[PDB]
Design a protein around this nucleic acid. Structure first.
Lengths: 93, 56, 78, 110, 136
RNA sequence: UUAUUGGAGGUAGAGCACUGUUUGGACGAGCGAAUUCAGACAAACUCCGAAUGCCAAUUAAUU
RNA sequence: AUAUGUUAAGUGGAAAAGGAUGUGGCGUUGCCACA
RNA sequence: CUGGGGCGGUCGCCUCCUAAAAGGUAACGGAGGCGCUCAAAGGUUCCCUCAGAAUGGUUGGAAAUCAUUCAUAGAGUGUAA
RNA sequence: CUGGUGACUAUAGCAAGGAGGUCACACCUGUUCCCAUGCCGAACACAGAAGUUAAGCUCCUUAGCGACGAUGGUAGUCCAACUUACGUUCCGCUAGAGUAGAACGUUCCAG
C-alpha cells in the first residue's frame, strides 16, 4: 500500500515521458519542507488502490530518497479521453 | 583539425537558407570532405544541416 | 448584387527606424507612431507628428519608464 | 479634511519636469511652512546638496528675506553664477517672493 | 431555437475546426454526462431535436443541462449564382465541438435509465459520443 | 552563414480584468446579463504571452 | 534470407453513420457455479 | 475594370480588420468617414479634476439644479475609426 | 529615529488593532495690511493668544483584498522522417499551486 517510488536524474526527454506513461508509471514531484522539489516516479495501479483506502484528503507514507515522508496529494492532472492521470503533486507536511 | 565533415545528401530540393550553410563550411561537390577545428561557431553550423552532412 | 466595401487607405510605414546600440547622427529619426507609445528620453526630442528624433550623436538605447511604459535615450560615445 | 502638504507635492511634480536640469542648474529649492521657511541648493544629475541655510519676526517675512542674503553668500563662497528658481509648488508671492528678490540683488542672477 | 438576440457583426470568418477543446471537459452541473470523440459543427436545429428526444424518455424525472451554444453564424449564397459579387447571407448558427467537450448533462435519474436517454440523444448528433460520469 | 549579447513588434496558445455574447443557482436592487457563487464564446475582445522571423554590435570562427 | 507474433478476407490490391458470441493482447470484478 | 459580354455597381483621399507579434502584401473580401469648421476651438503664464451608484431636500426614482460618500477613468477631447 | 530633497516593475500600495507631542511638521485665533472667491478669509495669503494630539503625519503588529512568484507536467512550435496525423529533437506559454512580501534608500539639516 505504501508508495514504493524511484528517482529519475537529469532532464527526461519528451520521448521517455511518453514511454513512462505506457509502461504503467506516473511522474510526480514532492515540494514540501526541505525536500527541494525532488522529482519522483510512481506506479499507476498502486496509486488508485491506496487512495481508495485512506481517501482524497489523507496522508501517505511515501518512500522517497530511501526514507519515509508523510505527504498528501495536492492536485493532479487528468486526461478525460483515456480515463487516467498524468501527473501528481505531493505537498509534504 | 579534429572534425571531418563529408556531404552525403544533395542540396537539390532544399531551402536556400540551408544552401548557404553548406557553402559556409566548404562543401562544394557531393561526397566532399573538409577538416576544421571544433568550436561553438562551427558546431552550430553542422547542427543546422545535420540531415545533410555526417561528422566523424 | 453590388457591394459597398472595397476601399482602404495607403499604408503609413511606422515603427522603429534604428536598432538598439546603433550609432546615429544629430537629426536621425528613431520612431514613427500615432500617439505616444515610446516617450522621449534624454537627448531625444519630440516632433509635431509625435516623431522621435535624436538631437546629438551617440548610441541609442531603449529603457523603461515606470510600469507599463518605456522610453528611448541617446548617450555620447566614450 | 484637506491636507495642504500632501496636495502640495502633487504640484511640485508638475513643475519639476520643465526646470530641473533641462532648463538650468543648480536648482534652488524652497520649502515653506507655517512656522519657518527653508532653502537649499541641489544638483540634479549628481544628486547632492551644495549649500543649506534657513530661517530656523513678522510671522517669517523679514526672516524669509534673511534667507535670501544668507544663501547668496553661501552661493558666492564656492562660486556659482547662473541659477534656476524652483517655486516648490507655492505661488510666487509674499514670503517666497521676498526670498528671491533678496538673493537676486546680492550678485546672484537668475 | 437557440440563437443570440444580437451580434456585433452578422458575417464572420469560419472557426478553425482543428485541434482540441479548451474547456468543458468535465461534468460539473449534473451527474451523468456525454462526451465527444469527433470534431464537427452542431447546428442549433440539431440541439432541439436531441433535447426533445432526451427529455421525453424522462417524463418528469430530472433536469437536463445544455453545455454548448450556437454563437457563430454561417452564410450561404442564393441558388444559381456565379462566384464573387460579395458575400452571402446568414442561414443559421453553429458551435464548435472538439474531442473532449461535454455536450449534454443529465441529473435526477438512475444509472440504468441515464444510458438509454443519452443514447437516443447521440443518434441525433453527427459526432461520436461516450457515456461518462463525475470524476472522483 | 553560425556562436554570444541587446532591443523593437502582440500571431499561436490561453484567459474573462475591458466591450459584446451566454447556461444553471443564491439573493429584493430589476429576482442567473446593475450586485453574488460556479461554467462557457469571439478576425475587428485582451490583466497575459511563445516558437520563428527582423534590425543591430563593428563582439568571434568558417567562407 | 534469419528470428518472433498477427490476419482467412484474396484483406492487401476502393467508401461512412450504424450492427455483431470473428479472432488476439493487457486489465477490472462477484458466484467459486453456470448446466 | 468585370469569374464571357450587355444591365447594376465602382474609379481620388482617410481609419480599423483580413495581414501569418518588424515593414510591406491581393479579391465585385468584411465595416465607417472626407471635398470642411475655429478670431479663440491658436500662443503663453497661473489655478482646478471626472461619468455613474447611494441617505435625505422644495420630491419629476434621493441623477432637471443643491449637499455628503465611494469612484485608475466606466466621463471628456469641434467631426469617422 | 526628527525633518528637507532625489533615484528605484505596489517584495514601496489598500485595509484594520495599538503608542505617540506644544522645540519640528500640523490642528487652530483674527482680516489691519500684501493678494484672493464668475457667491463663501472654507481653499489661495498676511497676521498670530491659548488649547488638542481627536484627526493628518510618524512608528510598532497582523497575510482580509491587491502586487511578486520558481520546480514539475501540459498546450503551442523551428528543423527533420512517416505522411495528412502520427514518431523524433530544440525552444517552452497562460492558468494553477509551494513560497516572497507590512520596502530599499544616495546627499545635505536640527537633537
Amino acid at each position: 500500500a505504501s508508495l514504493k517510488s524511484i528517482i529519475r536524474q537529469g532532464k527526461q526527454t519528451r520521448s521517455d515521458l511518453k514511454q513512462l506513461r505506457k509502461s504503467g508509471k506516473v511522474p510526480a514531484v514532492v515540494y514540501g519542507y526541505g525536500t527541494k522539489n525532488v522529482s519522483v516516479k510512481v506506479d499507476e495501479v498502486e496509486f488508485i488502490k491506496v487512495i481508495r483506502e485512506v481517501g482524497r484528503n489523507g496522508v501517505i507514507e511515501l518512500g522517497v530518497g530511501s526514507k519515509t515522508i508523510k505527504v498528501m496529494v495536492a492536485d493532479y492532472q487528468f486526461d478525460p479521453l483515456k480515463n487516467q492521470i498524468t501527473h501528481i503533486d505531493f505537498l509534504a507536511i | 583539425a579534429k572534425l571531418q565533415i563529408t556531404l552525403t545528401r544533395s542540396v537539390i530540393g532544399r531551402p536556400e537558407t540551408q544552401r548557404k550553410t553548406v557553402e559556409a563550411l566548404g562543401l562544394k561537390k557531393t561526397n566532399s570532405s573538409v577538416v576544421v577545428e571544433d568550436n561553438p561557431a562551427i558546431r552550430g553550423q553542422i547542427n543546422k544541416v545535420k540531415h545533410l552532412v555526417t561528422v566523424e | 448584387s453590388s457591394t459597398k466595401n472595397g476601399r482602404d487607405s495607403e499604408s503609413k510605414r511606422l515603427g522603429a527606424k534604428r536598432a538598439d546600440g546603433q550609432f546615429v547622427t544629430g537629426g536621425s529619426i528613431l520612431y514613427r507612431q500615432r500617439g505616444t507609445k515610446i516617450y522621449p528620453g534624454e537627448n531625444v526630442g519630440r516632433g509635431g507628428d509625435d516623431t522621435l528624433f535624436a538631437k546629438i550623436d551617440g548610441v541609442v538605447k531603449f529603457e523603461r519608464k515606470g510600469r507599463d511604459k518605456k522610453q528611448v535615450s541617446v548617450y555620447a560615445v566614450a | 479634511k484637506i491636507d495642504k502638504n500632501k496636495v502640495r507635492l502633487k504640484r511640485h511634480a508638475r513643475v519639476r519636469t520643465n526646470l530641473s536640469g533641462t532648463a538650468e542648474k543648480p536648482r534652488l529649492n524652497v520649502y515653506r511652512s507655517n512656522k519657518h521657511i527653508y532653502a537649499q541648493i541641489i544638483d540634479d544629475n549628481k544628486g547632492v546638496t551644495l549649500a543649506q541655510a534657513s530661517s530656523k519676526t513678522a510671522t517669517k517675512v523679514e526672516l524669509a528675506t534673511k534667507v535670501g542674503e544668507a544663501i547668496a553668500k553661501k552661493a558666492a563662497d564656492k562660486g556659482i553664477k547662473e541659477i534656476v528658481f524652483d517655486r516648490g509648488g507655492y505661488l510666487y508671492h509674499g514670503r517666497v517672493k521676498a526670498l528671491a528678490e533678496a538673493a537676486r540683488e546680492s550678485g546672484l542672477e537668475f | 431555437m437557440l440563437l443570440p438576440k444580437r451580434v456585433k457583426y452578422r458575417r464572420q470568418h469560419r472557426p478553425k475546426t482543428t485541434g482540441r477543446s479548451k474547456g468543458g471537459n468535465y461534468v460539473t452541473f449534473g451527474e451523468f454526462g456525454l462526451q465527444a470523440t469527433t470534431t464537427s459543427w452542431i447546428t442549433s436545429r440539431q440541439i432541439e431535436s436531441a433535447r426533445i428526444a432526451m427529455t421525453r424518455y424522462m417524463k418528469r424525472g430530472g433536469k437536463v443541462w445544455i453545455k454548448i451554444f450556437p454563437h457563430t453564424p454561417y452564410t450561404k449564397k442564393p441558388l444559381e449564382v456565379r462566384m464573387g459579387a460579395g458575400k452571402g447571407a446568414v442561414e443559421g448558427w453553429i458551435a464548435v465541438v472538439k474531442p473532449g467537450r461535454i455536450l449534454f448533462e443529465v441529473a435526477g435519474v438512475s444509472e440504468e435509465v441515464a444510458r438509454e436517454a443519452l443514447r437516443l440523444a447521440s443518434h441525433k448528433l453527427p459526432v461520436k459520443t461516450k457515456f461518462v460520469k463525475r470524476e472522483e
